[PDB]
């Protein structure tokens, strides 16, 4: 859900580092302006198309 820049065609990215958004570097810990980059789907049979 969050990346510093775009991706070149036919490229993959697996690195998981805390995406800093605020000015202060939070040294890679969870908190304000420091979100984990990998979000999660949720799937249930009752969803709609």
């Amino acid at each position: 859900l969050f990346r510093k820049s775009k991706l070149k065609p036919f490229e993959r990215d697996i690195s998981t580092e805390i995406y800093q958004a605020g000015n202060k570097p939070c040294n890679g810990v969870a908190g304000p302006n420091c979100y984990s980059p990998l979000q999660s789907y949720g799937f249930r049979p009752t969803y709609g198309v």
Binding site: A21, N23, Y47, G48, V49
Partner: protein
């Protein structure tokens, strides 16, 4: 970097978790409402606690972004809603005290019961027996006593708790920047930041008063006609110039005058429009009714329901051990799931209710693309109005003839239109003064200008002034009559029922104009028309992304609510009532009192 990018980053996270948590809480609520068990209640409590708790931290975290550095005006709306609706400012002891009082309010109202005099043998509840008695029984003593008994056994208990309740709510608004808890409600219609569309909180009071001034002649003429007809039922008790007794309105509080239709029919000899027997002859079931309702929406161009709606929604009472509430509701669980919860019988009312409920679902699907915090109507009135404009067209004889329930041999003349208009009048026109009266008094009591010792004193004084209804038994300050109302005890805003009614007739007049319809307004259909459908759909998809003044402009062309379409709808009834009131005095006298 700048605040704007950081705020957008935070919003792009909040939306993701909000969707999932809302689904879990809403699904748990649906499970209990269709399956009444103790563990379902526990599931609601757990899911509700997580959703309530999650909103608390997000409200706390949103404080770090000052609102004066946002110029997009779209992020500001989301930030304002998030900060406001989950922020708590009272102390812990005061917070739990307010929660305990509110729980007491709901508990006493649900558990309240009154029964026959000097007989503790058998007793009944308000919903099963009291509603039926005031709607059907014509006994003067029974109606008067039951009206007095319920208020005595409910208002007296609720009086001191309301006095503590009004206080704590005031410091809640006082702690915030609002002047009083009354202004907190009036902030829903507030619009700021847009030139040519700004709406002030104080402007609403002036607008409401001005609108009610013009609709006075219609109400008093109807009141005079009602008084004359009711003279036949209770001659001795009713005075030709006094106010009507409060226990002879056909319901508990006189909110609706529907129950007086039989006693006040204009032409009883002529047949009434009814299709219940026609559906019985044609063997109509629940699915057929909803399919017919669905086809109506397709005929105007709106897309019809998905497969998930048909499989998941239930339309019939399960019966047996499976017990569920039969109150018609339209559920929007989010993430592409829409369901309708109601128990359906083969009646005209259920046929019309299907159209009314289906309107809410279509409105919900309209703004599915908007962000999570903006998935709502422009205000508290638009949502109700949308689901009511379509019930008007469904009941028109032309639509019934086109479907085929009504025989083509039916004809229309004086009485058919007059009877139909008067039946609508007793449901729509009558409730407007009652709603305005309750809201205005409740505004004054929260303002603090009225002392506690004059709460009941001023309450009845204005009842004989505007509503023109006099109480049948005097009451002191021990009673708390407004507390007997369901909405008052449960802390619900009541002004939405006054803005909604005036909104719906503005929409119907505009759509009928776009449909190139001619003739009387009350005979209008939009089934084949598609220009009306696309014009309506343009406003529906907006959601909360635009000020409600702009949304109103995009449909009718005005920046404020108006009363002309409502009067134009009932104009033929107004002329006939003027003819019938030639020999009847117009206006009620406040000096008369039924109890000597």
């Amino acid at each position: 970097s700048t605040i704007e990018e950081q705020a957008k980053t935070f919003l792009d996270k909040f939306n993701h978790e909000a969707e999932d948590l809302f689904y879990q809480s809403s699904l748990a609520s649906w499970n209990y409402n269709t399956n009444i068990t103790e563990e379902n209640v526990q599931n609601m409590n757990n899911a509700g606690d997580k959703w309530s708790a999650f909103l608390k931290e997000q409200s706390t975290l949103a404080q770090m972004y000052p609102l004066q550095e946002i110029q997009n005006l779209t992020v500001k709306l989301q930030l304002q809603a998030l900060q406001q609706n989950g922020s708590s400012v009272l102390s812990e002891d005061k917070s739990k005290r307010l929660n305990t009082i509110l729980n007491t309010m709901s508990t006493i109202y649900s558990t309240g019961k009154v029964c026959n005099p000097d007989n503790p043998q058998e007793c009944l509840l308000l919903e099963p027996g009291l509603n039926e008695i005031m709607a059907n029984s014509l006994d003067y003593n029974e109606r008067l006593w039951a009206w007095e008994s319920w208020r005595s056994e409910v208002g007296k208990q609720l009086r001191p708790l309301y006095e503590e309740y009004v206080v704590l709510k005031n410091e809640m608004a006082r702690a915030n920047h609002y002047e009083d808890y009354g202004d907190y409600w009036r902030g829903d219609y507030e619009v700021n930041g847009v030139d040519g569309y700004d709406y002030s909180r104080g402007q609403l009071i002036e607008d409401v008063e001005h609108t009610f001034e013009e609709i006075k002649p219609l109400y008093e003429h109807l009141h005079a006609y009602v008084r004359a007809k009711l003279m036949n039922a209770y001659p001795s008790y009713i005075s030709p110039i006094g106010c009507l007794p409060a226990h002879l309105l056909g319901d508990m509080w006189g909110r609706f005058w529907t129950n007086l239709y039989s006693l006040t029919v204009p032409f009883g000899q002529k047949p009434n429009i009814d299709v219940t027997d026609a559906m019985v002859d044609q063997a109509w079931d629940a699915q057929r009714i909803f399919k017919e309702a669905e086809k109506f929406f397709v005929s105007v161009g709106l897309p019809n329901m998905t497969q998930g709606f048909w499989e998941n929604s239930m339309l019939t009472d399960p019966g047996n051990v499976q017990k569920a509430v039969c109150h018609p509701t339209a559920w929007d669980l989010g993430k592409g799931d829409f369901r309708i919860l109601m128990c359906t019988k083969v009646t005209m009312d259920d046929f019309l209710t299907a159209h009314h409920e289906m309107g809410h679902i279509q409105y919900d699907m309209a703004y599915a693309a908007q962000p999570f915090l903006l998935r709502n109507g422009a205000n508290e009135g638009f949502h109700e109005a949308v689901g009511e404009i379509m019930s008007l067209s469904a009941a028109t004889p032309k639509h019934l003839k086109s479907i085929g329930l009504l025989s083509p041999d039916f004809q229309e003349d004086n009485e058919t239109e007059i009877n139909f208009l008067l039946k609508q009048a007793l449901t729509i026109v009558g409730t407007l003064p009652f709603t305005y009266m309750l809201e205005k008094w409740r505004w004054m009591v929260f303002k603090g200008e009225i002392p506690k010792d004059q709460w009941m004193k001023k309450w009845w004084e204005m009842k004989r002034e505007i509503v023109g209804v006099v109480e049948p038994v005097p009451h002191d300050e021990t009673y708390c009559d407004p507390a007997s109302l369901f909405h008052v005890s449960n802390d619900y805003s009541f002004i939405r029922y006054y803005t909604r009614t005036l909104y719906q007739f503005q929409f119907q007049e505009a759509l009928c104009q776009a449909a190139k319809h001619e003739g009387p307004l009350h005979k209008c259909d939009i089934s084949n028309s598609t220009e009306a459908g696309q014009k309506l759909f343009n406003m529906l998809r907006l959601g909360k992304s635009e000020p409600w003044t702009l949304a109103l402009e995009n449909v009718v062309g005005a920046k404020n609510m108006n009363v002309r379409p409502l009067l134009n709808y009932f104009e033929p009834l107004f002329t006939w009532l003027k003819d019938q009131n030639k020999n009847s005095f117009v206006g009620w006298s406040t000096d008369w009192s039924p109890y000597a």
